[PDB]
Amino acid sequence: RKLRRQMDIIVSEVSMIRDIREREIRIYTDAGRICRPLLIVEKQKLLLKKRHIDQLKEREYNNYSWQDLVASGVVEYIDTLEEETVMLAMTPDDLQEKEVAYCSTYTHCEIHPSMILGVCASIIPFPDHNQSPRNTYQSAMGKQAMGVYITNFHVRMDTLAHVLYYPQKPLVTTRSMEYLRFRELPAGINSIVAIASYTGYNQEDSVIMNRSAVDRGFFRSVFYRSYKEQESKKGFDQEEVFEKPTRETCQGMRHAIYDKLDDDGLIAPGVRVSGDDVIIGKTVTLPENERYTKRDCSTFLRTSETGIVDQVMVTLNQEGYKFCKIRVRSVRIPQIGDKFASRHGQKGTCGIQYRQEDMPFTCEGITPDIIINPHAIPSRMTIGHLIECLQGKVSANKGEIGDATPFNDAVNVQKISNLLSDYGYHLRGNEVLYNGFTGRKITSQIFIGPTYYQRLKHMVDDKIHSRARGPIQILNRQPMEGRSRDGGLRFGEMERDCQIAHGAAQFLRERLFEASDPYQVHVCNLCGIMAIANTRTHTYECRGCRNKTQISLVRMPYACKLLFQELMSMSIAPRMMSV
């Protein structure tokens, strides 16, 4: 250890584990050991002294860095096998002092306990007041929020992007945020939330969002898709070329408006594409043997994607061909359906958007931007949400970004309450509100304050399906995805079981026969083999028995027809015996 704290064996992970009772020493020098930086405690006294903190404070002027701290032997890397041989203190302020002695031989000391939390879990403020499942749910949702994901997003051409218009720093921030660079690239807005049950449209995890707010920029976002198209020449004379396929003088126009395409074959930037629009135009050449030789193979935009063209790029890929990438920009305003979620593990969907005149208001015209329901708090015990609203109130009034470092004994709820009462509000954070519909005061006093909400990337315009009678498959003649977004919904075994339970034979018949795959087959009464040769000259005939009089009609799924045919193809003869 005396060597590893200066230099002979790499101050980095060369663990030394002396297992006393077992009588072994185990020195590991290999890749894959998760180490951890921990201070050193010699004789119940830290090796870190004010000289080190002062030298580190003047970091930019000195050449004193973390490496000079590790060379000085005050911080060493303890891996896990060495951790089962050391006695730690969480905070030096205690656990190194005198009382009825818990431990008199400490060996190390945590730098700060909030370093057991990862990146996506260091965002959540007051993560010690929340329930742990909610903290994991936040570590999940915090990876699905919208924001400036990187600064150079105007020169990235990514398949899917999302840029929140006006993001904000948090007001109640964890002190480990300046290292994840969240003040630089945030992912939310500091909405004024009020835990009220205003009119009913926020029950069961739902939110009432101010329409005036969303109409002044609150939570707008752009959705930058990016399509791709290569210009291949695979077989000789099977050349594909970017070119506006005009009309006859080329075949396969597919009946779409090609007005947008420039002569090159690519739409120009700033042209409001739509559903029945073609973005790229290719014309592959026929084999020149057996219209002109140019077929039409033009990329079509799906109706689920609309917007305006932002960039058009042309270049040679590594395969050498010409290769383009268009970028279609779409502005999304938050509306009924979109998912918003706090930093504390509470997700909801906007159920209605009232206007400023209709929302509640305090004595000073402050209207809530979001009204989450109270029923979300008790069964989830996210009491870090409440404290976050309170600290955000005190912060917005005072003027300093509040501190919500997880394990800090100088941020008590009582202190936040006194700070808030020092500024003219109710100390617990409640305020008397009014009802914008009528004007009367709401009897109970609604909890209101600025909390940090996020816009998740689950917008409802990306989730609507609807199939009336659409594209059918070639083999099974079951429904299939097409141009429009919907190809169908499965009527699985569980739904079949439920409809069996109801007793609805007719609806189950419709769902499994007449809404998926209806078919009529002519079958021979004598031999159940359906190989009748029906004709519009009215000659029903069964080769196999020499019988043209005993043919009957049978309705059955084309799936059942294909099954009986794939069976007949194995010499298994299924005989639909109508008698």
Give the interface with Zn ion as residue ranges (CB under 5 A): 524, 526-527, 542, 544-545
The only residue of 282, 294, 393, 457 in contact with other proteins, by rule CB under 8 A: 393
Q: Does 329 bind other proteins (CB under 8 A)?
A: yes
CA-to-CA separations, 136 to 125, 326, 338, 540, in angstroms, rounded: 13, 38, 21, 68
Q: Which of 67, 136, 238, 274 binds other proteins (CB under 8 A)?
A: 136
Residue 111 binding other proteins, by CB under 8 A = yes
Give binding residues for DNA as ranges: 483, 490
Q: How far is the CB of 369 from Zn ion (least distance, A)?
A: 11
Find the shortest distance in angstroms from Cβ 346 to Mg ion: 13
Considering only residues 342 through 361, tell me which ones interact with other proteins, judged by CB under 8 A: 347-352, 354-358, 361
Token pair for 320: 């050498």
- When asked if residue 308 is in the footprint of other proteins (CB under 8 A), the reply is yes
Regarding 3 and contact with other proteins (CB under 8 A), the answer is: no
Looking at the Cβ atoms of 251 and 311, the one nearer to other proteins is: 311
Stretch that binds Mg ion, among 204-212, 266-274, 380-388, 456-464 (CB under 5 A): 204-212
CA atoms within 13 A of residue 354's CA, in its CB half-sphere = 21
Binds Mg ion (CB under 5 A): choice among 184, 204, 357, 566: 204
User: Which residues pair with residue 451 across a beta bridge?
Assistant: 191
Active site residue 93: no
Is residue 426 within 8 Å of 433, Cβ to Cβ? no
- Regarding 262 and contact with Mg ion (CB under 5 A), the answer is no
> Taking contact as CB under 5 A, which single stretch among the options 169-177, 203-211, 385-393, 469-477 is the one that binds Mg ion?
203-211
CB of 455 vs Zn ion, minimal distance in Å: 20
Q: Which is nearer to Zn ion, 166 or 507 (CB)?
A: 166
Partner from Mg ion, Zn ion, other proteins, none binding residue 222, C-beta < 5-8 Å depending on class = other proteins
Q: Buried b / exposed e across 469-478, counting CB within 10 Å, b at 16+?
A: eeeeeeeebe
3-state secondary structure at position 418: helix
The binder of 203, among other proteins, Zn ion, Mg ion, none, by C-beta within 5 to 8 A per type, is: other proteins
Pairing relationship of beta strands 520-524 and 278-280 according to DSSP bridges: unpaired
**Catalytic site residue from 205, 264, 403, 486:** 205
Binding residues: 144, 205, 254, 295, 347, 483, 490, 524, 527, 542, 545
The answer to whether the CB of 87 falls within 8 A of the CB of 107 is yes
Considering the complex, state which of residue 65 and residue 549 has its C-beta at the smaller distance from Zn ion. Answer: 549
Comparing CB distances to Zn ion, the nearer of 78 and 551 is: 551
Beta carbon of residue 328, minimum distance to other proteins (angstroms, whole number) = 12
- Of 334 and 348, nearer to Mg ion (C-beta) is 348
Cα–Cα distance for residue pair 429/445, rounded to 1 Å: 10
Among the listed ranges 64-72, 274-282, 293-301, 381-389, the one in contact with other proteins (CB under 8 A) is: 381-389
- Total residues found in the chain within this entry: 579
Q: Among residues 120, 154, 126, 114, which one has the least CA distance to residue 387? A: 126
Q: Which of 257, 363 has the CB closer to other proteins?
A: 363
List beta partners, residue 206: 349
User: C-alpha 283: how far from its chain's center?
Assistant: 38
DSSP string, 105-161: ---EE-S-GGGGS-STTSSSSSTTTS-HHHHHHHHHHTTSB-S-S-S-TTT---SS-
Q: How far is the CB of 478 from other proteins (least distance, A)?
A: 6
Instruction: Say whether residue 419 binds other proteins (CB under 8 A).
Output: no
Supply φ then ψ for residue 520, to 5 degrees.
-115, 135
Q: Closest CB to Mg ion belongs to which residue?
A: 204
Contacts with other proteins in 253-272 (CB under 8 A)?
Answer: 262-264, 266, 268-272
Binding region for Mg(2+): 205
What are the distances in angstroms from CA 193 to CA 190, 207, 342, 373? Answer: 9, 10, 10, 10
Name residues contacting other proteins, limited to 278-307 (CB under 8 A).
none
Three-class secondary structure assignment of 154-187: CCCCCCCCCEECCCCCCCEECCCHHHHCCCCCCC
In sign, the C-alpha dihedral spanning 477, 478, 481, 484 is positive
Can residue 175 be called a binding residue for other proteins (CB under 8 A)? no
Residues 529-548 that bind other proteins (CB under 8 A): 529, 531, 533-534, 538, 540, 542-546
- How do beta strands 278-280 and 299-300 pair? antiparallel
Closest CB 222 distance from other proteins, rounded Å: 7
Chain CA centroid to CA 439, Å: 40
Q: Which does 239 bind (CB under 5 to 8 A by kind): Mg ion, Zn ion, other proteins, none?
A: none
Residues designated as active site: 205
Residues interacting with Mg ion, by CB under 5 A?
204
